[PDB]
Amino acid sequence: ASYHVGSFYNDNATAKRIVDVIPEEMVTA
Amino acid sequence: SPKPFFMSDASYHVGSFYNDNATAKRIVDVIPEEMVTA
Amino acid sequence: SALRVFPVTTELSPTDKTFEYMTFDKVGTAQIIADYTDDLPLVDALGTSEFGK
Amino acid sequence: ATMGIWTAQELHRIKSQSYEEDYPVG
Amino acid sequence: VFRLGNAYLISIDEIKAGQATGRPLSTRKASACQLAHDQLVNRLVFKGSAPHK
Amino acid sequence: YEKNPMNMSIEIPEAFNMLPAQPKDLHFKVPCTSKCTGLTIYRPMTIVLITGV
Amino acid sequence: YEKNPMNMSIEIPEAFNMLPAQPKDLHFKVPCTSKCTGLTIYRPMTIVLITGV
Amino acid sequence: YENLFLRPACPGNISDTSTYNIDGACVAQGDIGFGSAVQVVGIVDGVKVVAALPDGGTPYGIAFRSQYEHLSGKILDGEVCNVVSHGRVWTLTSLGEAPSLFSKLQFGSGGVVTGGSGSAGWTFAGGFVKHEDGYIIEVQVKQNAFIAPP
Amino acid sequence: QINASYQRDMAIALPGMVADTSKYNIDGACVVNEGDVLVGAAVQVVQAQAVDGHKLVKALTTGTTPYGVAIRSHWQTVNAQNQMIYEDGGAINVMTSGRVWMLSKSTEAPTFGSAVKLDVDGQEKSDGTIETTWTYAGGWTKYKDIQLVEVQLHQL
Amino acid sequence: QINASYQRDMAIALPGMVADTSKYNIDGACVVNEGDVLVGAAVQVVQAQAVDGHKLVKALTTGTTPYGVAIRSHWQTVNAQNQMIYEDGGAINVMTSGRVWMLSKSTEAPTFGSAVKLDVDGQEKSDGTIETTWTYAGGWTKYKDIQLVEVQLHQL
Amino acid sequence: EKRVTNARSPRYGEPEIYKVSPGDNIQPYLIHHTRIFIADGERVTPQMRKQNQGWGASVLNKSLIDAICDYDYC
């Protein structure tokens, strides 16, 4: 189910957090 | 489902949730307003 | 007294033979409706011209 | 009279090149 | 002067569905329309159309 | 024939373009349009067709 | 009659406005709406109508 | 490429999101109940005047449920009214058992479904549930199906 | 020496105008053949191309079957005899479903919901010879010396 | 040496494909366990649920009234002869109104506006014994070893 | 309204002029790009970005929405 991970990313905010907390803070440092 | 023609946009659902509920109000407004007043 | 009881203009080149002017008109109506309606009326436009020598 | 609002002239194109017949003198 | 046109449908299920390798279905269906337009232009040039004069 | 823009030409006033998707219940629809004119011959005495070859 | 907003009134709760255009295949639809009530007379006997003139 | 279903099965509302049409420029003479057939008695200034179905009339549409236009519970005289002219809709009925699928319905007095053996008109769509010691059926209304007799 | 104010009303319809925004359907993949078509009159289909797909339409004639009604357009129509027409060999906008304002030749208002009978020229008549399945939708007005009627059309 | 440039045309349609975008109506249903249904062939309804109206459909058989035509969609499998099919257990998309390309096994192109007659297996036949309300639309094409015809479908 | 795709200027692919239609029975009008600024929300996948006309998504996604919703039932 939901083999296309893009739908999972734009659907569940949790996966959103895991994927976007690190790089964006990284660059803003 | 059928909707009134004058109010038949996305604002009919997200707008209603923002307007009525208060936790959504907070989740939307706590960051930008303090953000800018800083 | 024909040239003085009526206006005289000079918006015409000496080599022209004819001229033309245009008119416009419109139609439409409005109706009393409820909230869940799908039969709003419509409007339109018009146009007409004429000539001279 | 129930015409439109645009005449045929306003949607007309005139190519800016003309063709003349030829006649060699001899 | 004449005008040409076509269209294509697509469903969210097929949009979300992924494949092993190759261009997406949306891109292929978009290329199909361009190919159809070009081929219709070539056919108009090389064969004509009686009803349209 | 003699390939010369003054003898014959093809006009493409509008290029291929795509319109925004128009959503329905669970699927979309995308139309595409363009314009053309066909082949016009200004001097038909500069083209020769050998048939029956 | 006496012109006084405490005797008679007309209400316009919602003024004229145009909704955003809804697109179709190659054309658009623009709906318009407004609100009105009509004439209301709070205090009668302040208006005299002379008929049969 | 499919059509979604609609959630609440109450009388007077639409049952699907297929192609439908709602004629909202109308006024009522007398009182009308949600989920009943109506007929057109006259036209004034582009407005259709509708009444509940009598004997001998040709039905035109079915009254439609709205929670702003009708605050009482039914449609009152001199009120603007919503009428469904094309689509699937839940109707009041006096029948006891479901008729054959895709048969032709027949309307008794007051705009209730009582027959399933008509010659031409609206057709049964396959829905049959129970309301208030009475039943509700699902009808498929089409625009030019019933033609006014000369 | 007292002021005055006057009132005037716009007309309601015009030959070939769509009545309202109900469920409608317009075919634009047709081509006019063998003559010209008047805006606000029924048309008939001669033949349909098997491969190309363009339909061939022309004016209504006795013994034929109506298909649709040409509608108004300020860009596709051609001005002639002081009105808008569709010339030969040009794309046409046929209406296959919805409410449309058609020309009429009758003298009395029609009955709502009754069947429409056309004349041999594609113009409405109370006692015409060509019978259809379209209906009268109630509208009945009159432009300057032009009589129009509002007709509901469905697919053939 | 002489340079060369070649040319080749595409096919017009595929079996069961929607012809154009003129006011279609597609609904979902469930296939009955008995028998497969070919995409682009008519189907029949055997039982409709009373709570909502969900329908169970199977292939057409003699002495039955058709419901719609199976179309190409996301859920569809391949048979032994590489024919595209709908499985016994699964969802099916059925078109009840609009223009669609549907399988034919006759030999001559049909005429516009006439009724469509089907066979027992649910395919077009010029002299079939099944009477239907659907109409011919004029499109007549030939995929590789496959015949197709364009049909206007009216809601039942 | 107006889109530029000129190769010379790197400013290709973005609208040059805008329709603005506020309403209040006044005519919608045109604004040049250089005067206005557009503000977007949260980033989304580019295939969604194109169908959303270069516009982000609301922070109230349905996971958060129904997480809020079932609380009242609780």
mmCIF file of N, CA and C in Angstrom, chain E:
data_model
loop_
_atom_site.group_PDB
_atom_site.id
_atom_site.type_symbol
_atom_site.label_atom_id
_atom_site.label_comp_id
_atom_site.label_asym_id
_atom_site.label_seq_id
_atom_site.Cartn_x
_atom_site.Cartn_y
_atom_site.Cartn_z
ATOM 1 N N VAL E 1 -7.892 30.745 -42.210
ATOM 2 C CA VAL E 1 -7.123 30.157 -41.115
ATOM 3 C C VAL E 1 -8.046 29.265 -40.288
ATOM 4 N N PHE E 2 -7.529 28.121 -39.834
ATOM 5 C CA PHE E 2 -8.291 27.131 -39.078
ATOM 6 C C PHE E 2 -7.620 26.845 -37.733
ATOM 7 N N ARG E 3 -8.389 26.223 -36.836
ATOM 8 C CA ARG E 3 -7.948 25.876 -35.492
ATOM 9 C C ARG E 3 -8.082 24.372 -35.279
ATOM 10 N N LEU E 4 -7.168 23.816 -34.486
ATOM 11 C CA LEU E 4 -7.095 22.386 -34.230
ATOM 12 C C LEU E 4 -7.074 22.146 -32.727
ATOM 13 N N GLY E 5 -7.565 20.978 -32.314
ATOM 14 C CA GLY E 5 -7.574 20.649 -30.900
ATOM 15 C C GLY E 5 -7.913 19.213 -30.547
ATOM 16 N N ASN E 6 -7.445 18.772 -29.382
ATOM 17 C CA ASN E 6 -7.745 17.445 -28.847
ATOM 18 C C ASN E 6 -7.638 17.518 -27.326
ATOM 19 N N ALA E 7 -7.664 16.362 -26.664
ATOM 20 C CA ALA E 7 -7.624 16.319 -25.205
ATOM 21 C C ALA E 7 -7.237 14.916 -24.755
ATOM 22 N N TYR E 8 -6.943 14.784 -23.461
ATOM 23 C CA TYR E 8 -6.691 13.474 -22.875
ATOM 24 C C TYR E 8 -7.163 13.453 -21.427
ATOM 25 N N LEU E 9 -7.602 12.273 -20.993
ATOM 26 C CA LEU E 9 -8.030 12.038 -19.623
ATOM 27 C C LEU E 9 -6.924 11.340 -18.847
ATOM 28 N N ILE E 10 -6.977 11.474 -17.521
ATOM 29 C CA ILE E 10 -6.059 10.783 -16.625
ATOM 30 C C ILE E 10 -6.698 10.739 -15.243
ATOM 31 N N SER E 11 -6.407 9.676 -14.501
ATOM 32 C CA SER E 11 -7.005 9.447 -13.196
ATOM 33 C C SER E 11 -5.938 9.478 -12.110
ATOM 34 N N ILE E 12 -6.351 9.896 -10.910
ATOM 35 C CA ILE E 12 -5.416 10.033 -9.797
ATOM 36 C C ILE E 12 -4.778 8.696 -9.452
ATOM 37 N N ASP E 13 -5.512 7.597 -9.627
ATOM 38 C CA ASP E 13 -4.948 6.276 -9.375
ATOM 39 C C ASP E 13 -3.735 6.029 -10.264
ATOM 40 N N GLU E 14 -3.877 6.292 -11.565
ATOM 41 C CA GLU E 14 -2.772 6.074 -12.491
ATOM 42 C C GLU E 14 -1.665 7.100 -12.285
ATOM 43 N N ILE E 15 -2.026 8.314 -11.864
ATOM 44 C CA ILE E 15 -1.014 9.322 -11.553
ATOM 45 C C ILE E 15 -0.145 8.862 -10.391
ATOM 46 N N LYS E 16 -0.772 8.346 -9.335
ATOM 47 C CA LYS E 16 -0.021 7.902 -8.165
ATOM 48 C C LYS E 16 0.751 6.622 -8.455
ATOM 49 N N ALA E 17 0.205 5.751 -9.305
ATOM 50 C CA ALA E 17 0.860 4.485 -9.600
ATOM 51 C C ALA E 17 2.227 4.712 -10.232
ATOM 52 N N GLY E 18 3.224 3.998 -9.719
ATOM 53 C CA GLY E 18 4.572 4.090 -10.241
ATOM 54 C C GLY E 18 4.977 2.849 -11.008
ATOM 55 N N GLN E 19 5.984 2.976 -11.868
ATOM 56 C CA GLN E 19 6.440 1.880 -12.706
ATOM 57 C C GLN E 19 7.935 1.675 -12.508
ATOM 58 N N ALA E 20 8.447 0.599 -13.108
ATOM 59 C CA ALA E 20 9.866 0.280 -12.979
ATOM 60 C C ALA E 20 10.735 1.372 -13.592
ATOM 61 N N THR E 21 10.619 1.578 -14.901
ATOM 62 C CA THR E 21 11.418 2.577 -15.593
ATOM 63 C C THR E 21 10.649 3.028 -16.830
ATOM 64 N N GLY E 22 10.933 4.242 -17.271
ATOM 65 C CA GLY E 22 10.277 4.816 -18.427
ATOM 66 C C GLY E 22 9.596 6.130 -18.099
ATOM 67 N N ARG E 23 9.224 6.860 -19.142
ATOM 68 C CA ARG E 23 8.568 8.142 -18.950
ATOM 69 C C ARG E 23 7.200 7.932 -18.302
ATOM 70 N N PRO E 24 6.729 8.874 -17.490
ATOM 71 C CA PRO E 24 5.415 8.717 -16.861
ATOM 72 C C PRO E 24 4.284 8.748 -17.879
ATOM 73 N N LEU E 25 3.159 8.157 -17.467
ATOM 74 C CA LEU E 25 1.991 8.071 -18.336
ATOM 75 C C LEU E 25 1.506 9.454 -18.741
ATOM 76 N N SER E 26 1.576 10.418 -17.821
ATOM 77 C CA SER E 26 1.177 11.783 -18.147
ATOM 78 C C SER E 26 2.051 12.359 -19.254
ATOM 79 N N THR E 27 3.368 12.160 -19.154
ATOM 80 C CA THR E 27 4.274 12.677 -20.175
ATOM 81 C C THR E 27 4.032 12.006 -21.522
ATOM 82 N N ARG E 28 3.839 10.686 -21.523
ATOM 83 C CA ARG E 28 3.559 9.990 -22.773
ATOM 84 C C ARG E 28 2.249 10.438 -23.411
ATOM 85 N N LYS E 29 1.191 10.599 -22.617
ATOM 86 C CA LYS E 29 -0.078 11.081 -23.141
ATOM 87 C C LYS E 29 0.001 12.526 -23.611
ATOM 88 N N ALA E 30 0.851 13.344 -22.996
ATOM 89 C CA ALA E 30 1.110 14.687 -23.495
ATOM 90 C C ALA E 30 1.858 14.687 -24.819
ATOM 91 N N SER E 31 2.826 13.788 -24.996
ATOM 92 C CA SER E 31 3.550 13.679 -26.258
ATOM 93 C C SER E 31 2.651 13.170 -27.381
ATOM 94 N N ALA E 32 1.695 12.305 -27.042
ATOM 95 C CA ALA E 32 0.757 11.782 -28.028
ATOM 96 C C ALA E 32 -0.030 12.907 -28.690
ATOM 97 N N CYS E 33 -0.452 13.899 -27.901
ATOM 98 C CA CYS E 33 -1.224 15.011 -28.450
ATOM 99 C C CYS E 33 -0.397 15.824 -29.441
ATOM 100 N N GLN E 34 0.863 16.101 -29.096
ATOM 101 C CA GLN E 34 1.730 16.848 -30.000
ATOM 102 C C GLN E 34 1.959 16.080 -31.294
ATOM 103 N N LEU E 35 2.189 14.770 -31.187
ATOM 104 C CA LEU E 35 2.367 13.962 -32.388
ATOM 105 C C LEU E 35 1.112 13.979 -33.250
ATOM 106 N N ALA E 36 -0.063 13.885 -32.621
ATOM 107 C CA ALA E 36 -1.311 13.915 -33.374
ATOM 108 C C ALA E 36 -1.490 15.243 -34.096
ATOM 109 N N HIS E 37 -1.177 16.354 -33.427
ATOM 110 C CA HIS E 37 -1.309 17.661 -34.066
ATOM 111 C C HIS E 37 -0.382 17.782 -35.269
ATOM 112 N N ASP E 38 0.883 17.384 -35.104
ATOM 113 C CA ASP E 38 1.828 17.491 -36.213
ATOM 114 C C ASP E 38 1.417 16.603 -37.383
ATOM 115 N N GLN E 39 0.982 15.373 -37.095
ATOM 116 C CA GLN E 39 0.544 14.486 -38.165
ATOM 117 C C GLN E 39 -0.702 15.014 -38.863
ATOM 118 N N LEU E 40 -1.628 15.627 -38.120
ATOM 119 C CA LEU E 40 -2.803 16.211 -38.757
ATOM 120 C C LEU E 40 -2.416 17.367 -39.668
ATOM 121 N N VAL E 41 -1.454 18.189 -39.244
ATOM 122 C CA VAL E 41 -0.993 19.282 -40.100
ATOM 123 C C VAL E 41 -0.386 18.728 -41.385
ATOM 124 N N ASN E 42 0.453 17.696 -41.256
ATOM 125 C CA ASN E 42 1.070 17.096 -42.436
ATOM 126 C C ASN E 42 0.011 16.501 -43.359
ATOM 127 N N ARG E 43 -0.996 15.842 -42.786
ATOM 128 C CA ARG E 43 -2.075 15.275 -43.586
ATOM 129 C C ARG E 43 -2.877 16.354 -44.298
ATOM 130 N N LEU E 44 -3.140 17.478 -43.627
ATOM 131 C CA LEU E 44 -3.829 18.585 -44.280
ATOM 132 C C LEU E 44 -3.019 19.115 -45.454
ATOM 133 N N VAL E 45 -1.700 19.222 -45.284
ATOM 134 C CA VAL E 45 -0.866 19.737 -46.366
ATOM 135 C C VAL E 45 -0.838 18.770 -47.545
ATOM 136 N N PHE E 46 -0.708 17.471 -47.280
ATOM 137 C CA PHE E 46 -0.424 16.509 -48.340
ATOM 138 C C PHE E 46 -1.652 15.798 -48.895
ATOM 139 N N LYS E 47 -2.825 15.952 -48.283
ATOM 140 C CA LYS E 47 -4.022 15.265 -48.754
ATOM 141 C C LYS E 47 -5.262 16.142 -48.835
ATOM 142 N N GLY E 48 -5.333 17.239 -48.088
ATOM 143 C CA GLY E 48 -6.478 18.119 -48.154
ATOM 144 C C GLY E 48 -7.684 17.576 -47.412
ATOM 145 N N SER E 49 -8.789 18.305 -47.550
ATOM 146 C CA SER E 49 -10.046 17.931 -46.902
ATOM 147 C C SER E 49 -11.179 18.569 -47.695
ATOM 148 N N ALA E 50 -11.997 17.739 -48.341
ATOM 149 C CA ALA E 50 -13.044 18.259 -49.218
ATOM 150 C C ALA E 50 -14.089 19.104 -48.496
ATOM 151 N N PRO E 51 -14.684 18.672 -47.375
ATOM 152 C CA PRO E 51 -15.736 19.499 -46.756
ATOM 153 C C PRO E 51 -15.265 20.874 -46.316
ATOM 154 N N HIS E 52 -14.013 21.009 -45.896
ATOM 155 C CA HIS E 52 -13.498 22.272 -45.386
ATOM 156 C C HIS E 52 -12.947 23.175 -46.479
ATOM 157 N N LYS E 53 -13.086 22.787 -47.747
ATOM 158 C CA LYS E 53 -12.576 23.565 -48.877
ATOM 159 C C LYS E 53 -11.068 23.779 -48.768
#
